[PDB]
Amino acid sequence: NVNVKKLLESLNSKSLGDMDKDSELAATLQKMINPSGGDGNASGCALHACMAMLGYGVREAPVPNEISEYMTGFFHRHLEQIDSEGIVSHPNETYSKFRERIAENILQNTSKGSVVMISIEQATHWIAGFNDGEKIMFLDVQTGKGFNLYDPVEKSPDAFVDENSSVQVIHVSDQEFDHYANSSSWKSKRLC
Secondary structure, rough: OOOOHHHHHHHHHOOOHHHHHHHHHHHHHHHHHHHOOOOOOHHHHHHHHHHHHHHOOOOOOHHHOOOOHHHHHOOOHHHHOOOOOEEEOOOOHHHHHHHHHHHHHHHHHHHOOOOEEEEOOOOEEEEEEEEEOEEEEEEEEEOOOOOOOOOOOOOOOOOEEEOOOEEEEEOHHHHHHHHHHHOHHHEEEEEE
């Protein structure tokens, strides 16, 4: 049975950058959550990242033909904030800088232990985001990457971000997460 509080300790006891550390946990979690490396629709994954980070347990995300039991209608309570403009990219802003400004905005509105679902360019893609007290961990348990903006190639910390790259941080209520936890959908997903 997989213990996330265990990983996080190990991880944080290394000479790695905040992006490495994310890229690492995410690549770890991705072999369990998205073993298939399915590059389909990625809300499923993004949320299992959240479930896992809250201590609900690591489980495989829905597959394409499971998105119908639960995720088909998961965001209805949040379509306005997704459809929104969100946190927009600056010009000459690098990837690292953007990620950092996105993090400091999340830290301002969340608490240690809290997670968020992160819409990238209006649900173009989906990543998770985990508050550890001190910093945000952006995880992309689908592609096994850390922070990214769903570009077709990898980007370096010092890459320049495209102009009007946008991200909308979605604060799913704890009820929504709990609702999903007592849901046969969740329960029938493979543990670890």
